[model samples]
Target chain A: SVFDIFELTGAARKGSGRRLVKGPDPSSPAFRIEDANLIPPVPDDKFQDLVDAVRTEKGFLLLASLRQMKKTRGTLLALERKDHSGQVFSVVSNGKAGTLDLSLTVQGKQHVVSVEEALLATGQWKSITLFVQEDRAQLYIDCEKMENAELDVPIQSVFTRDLASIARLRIAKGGVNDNFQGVLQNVRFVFGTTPEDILRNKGC
Target chain B: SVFDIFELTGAARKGSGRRLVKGPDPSSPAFRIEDANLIPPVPDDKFQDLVDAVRTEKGFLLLASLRQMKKTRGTLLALERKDHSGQVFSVVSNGKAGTLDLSLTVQGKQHVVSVEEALLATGQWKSITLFVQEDRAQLYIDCEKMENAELDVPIQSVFTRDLASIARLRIAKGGVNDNFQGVLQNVRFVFGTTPEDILRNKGC
Candidate 1:
């Protein structure tokens, strides 16, 4: 099934400390988390929505564009289980520092890779495709012309059962000394079956 | 002033393509494109380099992140430019399809608001700081507390001079249809003085 998960306009509330503003302005239609419930001022405010968005049986496709006014460091984008037992998967990068990082923490074990490795291993590609097979409880990262980045880990065992009820997709930037500073445009999320299914169904 | 600039990566290559095979060992520093030119590929096998590392100025940052992947859509990334024209700017998101696009194109105009407007905007926060500034150009995106997703516009003008040349930055991705995609990670051009001064110093 196809659904419009989040749409935002690049309009900021005047003088609000927020870098990227979220709303329904047509000129800049990208989504942003404004409410305190979804985005508390704390470090975790950025990721709550992202976490909630991925828990459904149907995975999602997220499209986001960002403009950095300054350099950002130690920024993270993670997918964790509710029980905190393990991390499903994550994609992170440091804007100011010039680095890309990824990790798949499963069963108390963490598998990590540098962005350079990931890109070279997958070839010098620009897009990343990830899928979570519900039946197999697996995650896959498909890079163009490069090798596939995969993790066949169980989700239930790492996080609490509450993770099954996650209704948010968290998108957090770093904080204070290493904060996320930029303009995020074209943030779109399309939820449905894994990418493989789409390919197969379309007779690719 | 703020705006968006989009760069086209280029067309796809033919053949089965090459995969990013793991290096002789995983522990060793990963393989990188240390000495490559940044020019577009032609009928012959000769590839071009985009920018050089040695000639880039300081304080300039580059960003090249994966944007998409798959056989149908291939791979793509958002190669962006910021604070280059002495203002905050970005290119519009031209969804995944078509040839590898990597050239300067405006996503939005620059300077739609003033420093005073930034201070008086509405929402939850107050006041913002300029993260990127040079000469008459200044940009401040809010990443504090919450990641601000906004797009600001500036006046438009044709950029005749080669901006990337000043910084010696180069970019390239892999072939088409195959999985090899390229991106610009922390690609930038920073000069010690204003654009005018740089021109004058060079006796231009």
Candidate 2:
């Protein structure tokens, strides 16, 4: 089986039970989910055919707003390719350290890079800025640069996977240890041109 | 005295004349401009104090959709600090070469980075992904990696600028020669936390 039946069922239950929060409605006035959407006020106005031309090409960015509720360790976001060896990218909040940990498995070897300061403030909302390019990774908390690291292997070379698969990109569930016990909001993916250079070539 | 009056006036006129173009209404349903906005469905539904808590912080990412109308040289986007030397970052399209050029003047010196392929296809919309670090800049066209260049100077040290001043950031104007004769959409700044580590520390 692609995934252990027990594990899949457990993950599903944990995900919904934790009140895995959803972001604002894509069609909300305040928050414009402008990923792969049509730029309004086009030349030919009052038309519906525009939607057909503007389809989901590819995803380049993933942005989310997180607020921790519990003190336990949990997975913030994880992306895994179908039938792949390991996770392409996994972001976790360390329970003991209270810092954010980013882990990637490249070529069967896992590399973990973390921040120094404790980020999960009891009930405060914190923003995370993570940028990964090939073997380099940088993390920032609340717009402050915590730390950065260089890995032995490139990230995309190992996964050879595109983020187009919506199911593979798991949020707050599939991690090394526990599910994220928090309120997640504004969790959405930003897309680019097409699937050719999904991860490797796209920038932060 | 800070700027040449004639140059500034010309830029202002050219800007409005070109239909420099504003993006979707931030309060639009189809596109939710989710940069620094309050995450919907909060604990207290009937709340007015929430807006005060969600104040404007720092800006990290700037995403825009560009469409080249004229086959002429122009400036797409240029970020300059108030009372600073040179533009913090400038993206220009070359008319003769039919290529996109990224220029930054750090510490009285200029660095030019260009993409190999012709990105400005006439009457077609093109997406540009520009990621700049302390000493590095990567330019991608339509999700394809064209080329990258390493700079001698860090972008933040020279200007010590923040993206708060809305007037400094110019779109479709303020380049070497001509104004961008194109339609720009989804042109909004994505802010991070409070001030400090505005550019150099933030990753792509």
Candidate 3:
């Protein structure tokens, strides 16, 4: 039930009434996605590998797109260990065009970094990847390597949870009246063997 | 009937029982509109003009916000002469980061401009203003001057309609299956005054 069920999609009706007579196409699923609330393009080629990470649903990668365009408070994209646990980390607006920050809150405080330029426009898509080893954690936007916007937590805290399951995603799962306020979408679960072994890679 | 009214919005509900409470402020009829979909913001300062424009329902100026992230096709924000006749002009994605085009279609052809750089990251907030003085069309993202992503239509064509009314906005009201796939918010409308005649001129 995590994914919205759609026969064909597009039309605001029941089945779009356009699914193939044979039923659905698992290989393609008949859906499309992109970056930008609809402004600056974060094309498939720009971050295909990062797209590769999110599509796979590994516990370390996230690809998100902000939909709202003003009064854009902060914390647009967030990752938390649990609802009340005061988000383990978040992606917040840097209050400037083409900039955002990786906000790690400790005792109600934030550890910041530029996570800089390229994502200041709303309605577009952006991707971030978190990598952790026995040492520490690293952050990446569009797979370009970011300054590891850090948290005040122990190194052990860097790695936890299903990683790529819906649990880690803040897609609108914030406070009752919170969410980045914009619209959000998440693909699905799991990790497999090779590069293209993602959720439903070649579709059904 | 095309709009989905929600009690506290964000959730997908049938129709919200709430209406413009006639108490605190009651000068005109309640509801204003964007396209067919979405509003709500982080407050004023986050994005002033856009906040100013969508907050009123006037004649010359219109501000809009699109709230969806993924599956956000093109026209995250659109201005159509009317719902039909294929959108007069639109802003579309080129799929490369920091890239997009202002598409103007006439005789089924689009005269375009990059309107380049910044304003592509979504999930927080972004703003755009379309200025028309019956001569040429200019676009502004985040209050910065955009290179008049001009339209080839006549100046008369520009001043037609109500000289800048709801008809000029494409707020999520894309065709049978169009829309930016995001929730949109229209602050209001107006055009009689100077540059800053928008909503709550100050901030939080």
Candidate 4:
């Protein structure tokens, strides 16, 4: 159908309108965790070209307030190729049944690094921080450092199919599901910093 | 393996953690409109039950800043029953077609009342203001009184089965599909306001 398109209002760089489309309050903009079932599109710069960006010791930090709504192990996030080439990196709940796992897929094979048991609690806030250098990666829950592994490969990315390494959070995909169900707030994804920096005051 | 559950740092009523989870700039807490595909949870009081909230000549007003990113009509917001009870109220893109439609479904029957043509203009910031009363419902585009109709129903809600009518915005059942592809801001849903207010200078 030759449908007439409607424009949504914006706070900046948008054309003039009687008003803008906004929430009740514009000062404190925070997305709902489990309630609204919404996810705003993220910018490209939010990524740290896993393989390319971290060739030799580039750190990655993801800060977000999280609440596990249910009691079960699921996938909180997936960073890999969509074509199923199997080059995948992920954060999974119930790591080894009691802990969390940083699972990675290489050449169709799965490599997982266990963080800690009960690291992610329900009805609470938590964060996943990681530092990788020289194939060795350090995992931290909240701020306490946990798993250290020797993958012997920098976190990689996929590009040919434009399937570069990016955070594809699927709290809705049901299966072993590896999907995360909960509330998340104030999330930050930064690349750079180092393993030593993680061990410092706060391993952000 | 027993993983360490490091407390992520945070504030307010939330529990304690090691570090605070936030963005690059916390002072300015605005999220990217198109990016981040997120929506904050709206408060209950944000809505006016129409007949219930505003009795006798009282009115409900919804103001939103919108932009049409595409040339096709899509859904902007849906207010309907959570259960499949077949009761609903909604705001759509180009509404049915060119004009905006305030559609209501009662007992499986759909009721539609429309506004002006091309109200949802693409690439332009447009404001949509609606006033609902017992006698009639009024609509304004960019502050221009576009449509007024005898609703005779005063708009209703169902709370028994928890099937209250509410906003369910779908910008991307497919951002590439029938999803709303645009930016929005400055949205306000106020009640107790009358039709004259819409025509007043700078009513928006």
Candidate 5:
């Protein structure tokens, strides 16, 4: 099992694909971490192949730990092949309902896995682990497992074709959805199913 | 009394300040209007002098007609002098509480004018007229005037200085808040106080 990490520490300095623009505070306290970097987008092309591989296999795993200061709803992450189309993969946070939703779309059908209400309360650190396999998709908030949901289609049919349409992956902002205004420690997209693989990639 | 119009027609064609990106539909129907252009940023310098003039004279007038398709909050419009600083003037739409807040900050004190509750219901066009004067401010929804509120400082002290700060004016998106996912027919920012002037600048 292998994984790719995008240390989404906003592009305040050099060597980053895009610069994290001004606004949100970078020196804010959280649950365990003293300060966290505000939200910013990571590139799409870097994780396209791995996304394709996992979608063709047992499905992919998305891991992230973050805190939201304001009660707001927006896309925390997304994987899209083209513009305007519904996201093939997306993680949307709803601060009004105080829940996080993980969406996976195959062909034209979309399946959602969401945690219960009040789990993502404001001003605290919460770790999220979303695993999507062929049979079932699961969501874990702060290491607490939620009920499993069934997937509509097989993982192999997620893309259904070649990389003719380039996949675009972004953290904290994607498509036409509003970007999440908060702090993120890290995000890891993994391609394994075993408990060992998931445990190894846990936490901030 | 005079006004300069941006006509926030998204840049799908030519002669627009910026192109309206894809994602939201342009054919959705609403109150009185058949369709609306999705959210996009109108340039800054286009209205800086007018903003400065209003701050020096009485407070400025901002008029816009919009409908929120999704019940999410962000900025409807904002007037800022520089990057990362608090907005000198802003109209923030909060979907959670179902209220539209008009905020004006002079020097450092911020005063807000808001409609009571449940006025801006989803899927209906709400014409907003926010008039900030030297002593009092008012908010009107579809020509129905709300209660008046007092300003902390004179309108002349809004900037308290010059145009060196370089004001930024954006529609549907501004500052560090979320972008309102809705339809906006038009926005008019005026520099006069006459009843005739307000009537002339009202509606979409």
Candidate 6:
């Protein structure tokens, strides 16, 4: 059977809006969703199957491109802690508002993921990748013009859990007051297995 | 008879003239002798006396101070690793050096002693207090202008017999070019027994 993406609710559903053809209201509480569709000429839910795949298994990958609806704000993505215990990891980048700050937190340890200052250009996308395992976990930020770098610091720890769900995959003006702004297109989450398994699947 | 200062020969001795003063050399070899009068500090030259002290002694203390003779360069006051081979443990610090970059290597494993940077100051005399016992040790650095601080770094190695004969202390310039000036004053290497009765009297 296919995995239900919205099975986990409450704090997991706090900031998440619904996946819609038109973006949700910037001020409405029902506007947050873990996955959405925001591609211009290409009009299909590219992230639905990927979200289903991850929810069915336990782990997954998420990828997004801010090519359309570029004038958004607040955190664009977040993988909140499974319990009321707070978020284990989050990725936030503001392309429309001329703010380019990327941060990741694990077990309450936070680190800046972005290499340079913030971003301020159209069609400029930052690729953030995260892997969670029982023993070891890592986060990477690959920019369009800079070298890919790891965001983990020396004294920080990673979250350890499987089948955990992300609380919010929000758009402009969400998370800690209206702080993020960007257009998100082609959101993909590949779940199940560990990062090693993902590498094996890619035959690397 | 009390121990008198003696000069070292060969390459091991270098600086402004080769006379063994009450303290350290300002040039080349930079470590200052804290207590200039007391010689043959540890192990007291006699193996049995040293062993008996270690097995039964309590509250043993060694005190010393190193003053900066020049500006813009740092110096190293390292405990001879060969001397600390067995169960011996000690701590050294110059709160004036800013950060406590102290290190200890025993049986191939090295540990960094914890020290706070705020407790250090420049152009001032800092007190390094060492408490030595069998199989355990602690190091403390005291400053007049700053609060006394204890380093978190611990000593876990066994003491060696060779260290007992460390009548001469070494001080070297810090940095790539090794340029610095320093003085060793009020140096004291007190022991429960004397070195001559321990080593020389035993024909060692």
In terms of lDDT, which candidate is strongest?
5
Clashes of each: 97, 8, 38, 39, 1, 45
What lDDT tens digits, residue by residue, belong to model 4 across residues A122-159? 55556555555445666676666477666634554211
Candidate 4 vs. true structure, TM-score: 0.40
Query: What are the DockQ scores of the candidates, in order?
Result: 0.01, 0.01, 0.01, 0.03, 0.01, 0.00
Better of 3 and 4 by TM-score: 4
- TM per candidate: 0.31, 0.33, 0.31, 0.40, 0.39, 0.28
Residue B179 lDDT in candidate 1: 27
What is residue B192's positional error in candidate 4, in angstroms?
A: 27
Q: What i-RMS does each candidate reach, in Å?
A: 17.9, 19.6, 16.1, 11.6, 11.2, 36.2
Q: For residues B1-204, what per-residue lDDT tens digits would candidate 1 score against the true structure? A: 111111122221111122111122222111122222233322111111222211232112222222222222221222223344322222211123322222223434433222222221122222122222222233232322211222231111212134342222223332233222322122223333443332233224
Model 3, A1-204: lDDT tens digits are 122212111211212221111102213222121221222112223223332443344334233333444445344545454345556555555434455555454445646555444453454444333343222345444445354433345432333333323124333233323334443333222223322222123231
Kindly report the docking quality category of candidate 6. incorrect
**Runs of candidate 6 exceeding 4 Å displacement:** A1-204, B1-59, B69-77, B81-97, B117-121, B132-156, B161-180, B190-204
Which runs of model 5 end up more than 4 angstroms from their true locations? A1-204, B1-45, B107-113, B193-204
Q: Is candidate 4 or candidate 5 better by TM-score?
A: 4
> Which prediction has the highest DockQ against the true structure?
4
Give the residue spans of candidate 2 off by over 4 A. Answer: A1-62, A81-88, A161-167, A189-204, B1-204
TM-score of chain A of each: 0.46, 0.56, 0.40, 0.59, 0.67, 0.43
1 against 2, candidate with superior TM-score: 2
Across residues B1-204, which tens digit of lDDT does each residue of candidate 6 receive? 111112121211322322222223222222343332222222234433433343445323444555544333333333343343421232333344554444454556655544454233355555454444433344455522222233233232333334445422333322233222344443343456432233332224
- Candidate 5 per-residue lDDT over residues A4-23, each given as its tens digit: 34343222322223222111
Better of 4 and 6 by TM-score: 4
Question: Candidate 5, which CAPRI tier?
Answer: incorrect
Worst 10 residues of 6 chain A by lDDT: A20-29
Off by over 4 Å in 1: A1-17, A20-27, A30-60, A67-76, A79-89, A94-100, A104-110, A113-147, A155-160, A164-169, A175-178, A193-204, B1-204
